[PDB]
């Protein structure tokens, strides 16, 4: 347990042979939703995406039930390819912006979300059908806004209470918004609940809802591969290594290792001591 144990790292992660994507100030979901600081990540691929502990959200605060599920789904696919679809939201106001989601010194919003408000103080029951006539699995990212006072629920949507229903052939999703003032993040007490819905080839996405809704602008392509995600603060260097740890790249010569349990690629097995 001495000569045959790899106990050191080079201090940095090799960008070869694996396609490495660095997060910088962005998380995977901040780049997924369309955080203005994360617009550079749109439609990029990766074999291993490294989130930094320095990452932060600089848009309009958002929460995600099953946050380790959605993060590991997008990570296992290894792509952010997004295709805009033409959802016909007739009777509403689109492209809603916020003062805490700034890009190019203007009020903006998530680039992959269409925050819908009333129109002419109308807001009818929106039933939008969207088929999946492809051969590959689609991923739709939608949201549910949580206004703080129904003073805003009336001002934004002109209904005392909303409700969101997302149905497919296999799945059905029902979410009711929660009116409530909350701790101000970037001077905002309101929140938005982000959910996800997968549709398979031949399946149809159904939206059976009035709109306290954060409508999607399209779908993400879903691939199946060895892609993954890792939390690390080690720099990225120009080198080649078939093993990556959050402490840096290590050689896979030894049959064992005590660098870190979290590994990626063809790596030795982890030992508890020495």
């Amino acid at each position, epitope marked *: 347990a001495t000569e045959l144990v790899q106990n050191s790292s080079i201090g940095e992660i090799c960008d070869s042979p694996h396609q490495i994507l660095d997060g910088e100030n962005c998380t995977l*979901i901040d780049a997924l939703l369309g955080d203005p600081q994360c617009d550079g990540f749109q439609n990029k691929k990766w074999d291993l995406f490294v989130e930094r502990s320095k990452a932060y959200s600089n848009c309009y605060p958002y929460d995600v039930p099953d946050y380790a599920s959605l993060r590991s789904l997008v990570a296992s696919s290894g792509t952010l390819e997004f295709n805009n679809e033409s959802f016909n939201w007739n009777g509403v106001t689109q492209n809603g912006t916020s003062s805490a989601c700034i890009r190019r010194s203007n009020n903006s919003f998530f680039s992959r979300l269409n925050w819908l408000t009333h129109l002419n103080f109308k807001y009818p029951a929106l039933n939008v059908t969207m088929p999946n006539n492809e051969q590959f699995d689609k991923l739709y990212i939608w949201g549910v806004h949580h206004p703080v006072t129904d003073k805003d629920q009336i001002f934004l949507y002109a209904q005392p209470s909303g409700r969101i229903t997302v149905s497919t052939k296999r799945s059905q999703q029902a979410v009711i918004p929660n009116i409530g003032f*909350r701790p*101000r993040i970037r001077n905002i007490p309101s929140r938005i609940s982000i959910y996800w819905t997968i549709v398979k080839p031949g399946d149809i996405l159904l939206i059976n809802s009035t709109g306290n809704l954060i409508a999607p602008r399209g779908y993400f392509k879903i691939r199946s591969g060895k892609s993954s995600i890792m939390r690390s603060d080690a720099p990225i260097g120009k080198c080649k290594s078939e093993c990556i740890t959050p402490n840096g790249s290590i050689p896979n010569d030894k049959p064992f290792q005590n660098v870190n349990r979290i590994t990626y690629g063809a790596c030795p097995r982890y030992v508890k001591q020495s």
Partner: antibody
Amino acid sequence: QVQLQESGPGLVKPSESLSLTCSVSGGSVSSNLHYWSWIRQLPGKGLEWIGYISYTGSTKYNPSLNGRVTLSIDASKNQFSLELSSVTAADTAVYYCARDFFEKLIADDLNAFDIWGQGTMVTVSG
Amino acid sequence: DIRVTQSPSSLSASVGDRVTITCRASQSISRSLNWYQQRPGKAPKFLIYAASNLQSGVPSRFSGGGSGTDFTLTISSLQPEDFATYYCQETYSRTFGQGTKADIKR
């Protein structure tokens, strides 16, 4: 706004069960996502969290106090009470009742103590 | 079991000085803590949320930062009305800090 006023005795003889009641005004005590808590003040120790309860009733308590704490909510009166059994001289303090929201969205943190009550002194000199 | 350490216990600074209070933890708590203010004879006040989000009654001179274990509360230009006792609470612990009350350099 949502006001909170603690009511109860200012003197409690030792070995007795301390009892205080917080009254919530301007809002519904029943809340879908909310906890109601109690916290005590001593000069030299600062603040010390005590208990915390949901509308359904869900409790966890400070392990420093060995289960001597028992809170309770009555939605018919918009009130929630504190009951501390077997009080000693180390239990004289200032007790506050506070409206708290919990969020845990990605950070898994988010125990927020929003509104705080005026306060009531209690003494154990007896 | 979570440990909290707040430093210093007390200090002194002039009007307009830049003072920093440190709240250290034994275990990593991510970007997760909050800072409060209780003035004498008053209940505490909800100042900062999630280590760096200022709240309703902030005068903009207050600020916080930090990640992991070492968090900092900073007052850019210390004002007289800032005289109070400051606490840091860690959530999953539900433990209050020891407290730091400082006063204006007289």
